[PDB]
Structure 1
Amino acid sequence: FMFVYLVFLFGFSTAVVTLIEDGGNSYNSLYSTCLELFKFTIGMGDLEFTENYDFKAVFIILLLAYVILTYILLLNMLIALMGETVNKIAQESKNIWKLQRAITILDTEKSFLKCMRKAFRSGK
């Protein structure tokens, strides 16, 4: 998810910062544009966070395309994939937890062997 997300974010951030001319709040920075476009993902994205562009239609089209492609498409697809994965591994997780607890039991027994090596023996 993060590989795909970062590909999209970097592509659109490079496009946006290329469009901006900074002539402003020094928004003509790759880091600042990347952060401002990432805010869109967490429901805090300002659609007009700058006005240092010669063409407003291009800027708004790029922002809307990014929003629809990541905020609406990628994130909901991730929700769907997480749901599918939860169903697939409903029973496998139980087995993994059992193995983890078994390893815990073995480690605890081996550590406590010093205090009582054969005192705690199973079965009669």
Structure 2
Amino acid sequence: YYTRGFQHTGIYSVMIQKVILRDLLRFLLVYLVFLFGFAVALVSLSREPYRSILDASLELFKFTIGMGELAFQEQLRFRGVVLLLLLAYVLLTYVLLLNMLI
């Protein structure tokens, strides 16, 4: 809060709070909706390794940078659809990031 004084160093640090708080909120809401949907989907696949909804959400949050990928061999013959869903989540996250920058 005390960066409001000082010198010109605050010029770029005072205008961010008027557009970031408006844009990041909506975009993060959309991202969380997508993340929870994908997590529920992965739990549905793994039910019959993504045990709880919280664990799946954590995995999806890690997928953007650190992954939990390389599915466990024979995942009830649904490895292909799981991999396709993971790729789809990657593309949605990346396009949301590009929309963030734009």
Cross-structure match for 1:28: 51
Query: Which structure shows the bigger proportion of residues in helix conformation?
Result: 2
Structure 1: stretches of 5+ with no match in the other structure: 81-124
Matching residue's letter, 1:18: S
| Aligned residue runs from structure 1 range 88-107, under 5 A | none
Cross-structure match for 1:62: 85
What TM-score, normalized by structure 2, do the two folds share? 0.65
Cα distance 1:62–1:50, how it changes in 2: closer, same or farther (>3 A)? Answer: same
Q: Is contact 2:63–2:90 with CA below 8 Å preserved after alignment?
A: yes
Report how far residue 77 of structure 1 moved.
1.0
Cα distance 1:4–1:52, how it changes in 2: closer, same or farther (>3 A)? Answer: farther
Cross-structure match for 1:2: 28
Matching residue's letter, 1:30: I
State the percentage of identical aligned residues.
45
Give the Cα separation in 1 of the matches to 2:89 and 2:38.
7
1:26-78 deviation per Cα after TM superposition (whole angstroms, max 9, x unaligned) = 5311111100100123x1113225457311111101100001111x2001110
Matching residue's letter, 1:16: L
Structure 2: stretches of 5+ with no match in the other structure: 1-26
Give the Cα separation in 2 of the matches to 1:39 and 1:74.
16
Cα distance 1:35–1:49, how it changes in 2: closer, same or farther (>3 A)? Answer: farther
Which residue of the other structure, out of 20, 24, 44, is the alignment partner of 1:18? 44
RMSD: 1.9
Matching residue's letter, 1:66: Y
Query: What is the aligned residue count?
Result: 75
| Aligned residue runs from structure 1 range 102-121, under 5 A | none
Give the Cα separation in 2 of the matches to 1:76 and 1:48.
26
What TM-score, normalized by structure 1, do the two folds share? 0.54
Q: Which has the larger radius of gyration?
A: 1
Cross-structure match for 1:83: none
SS in 2 for 1:20: helix
Matching residue's letter, 2:85: L
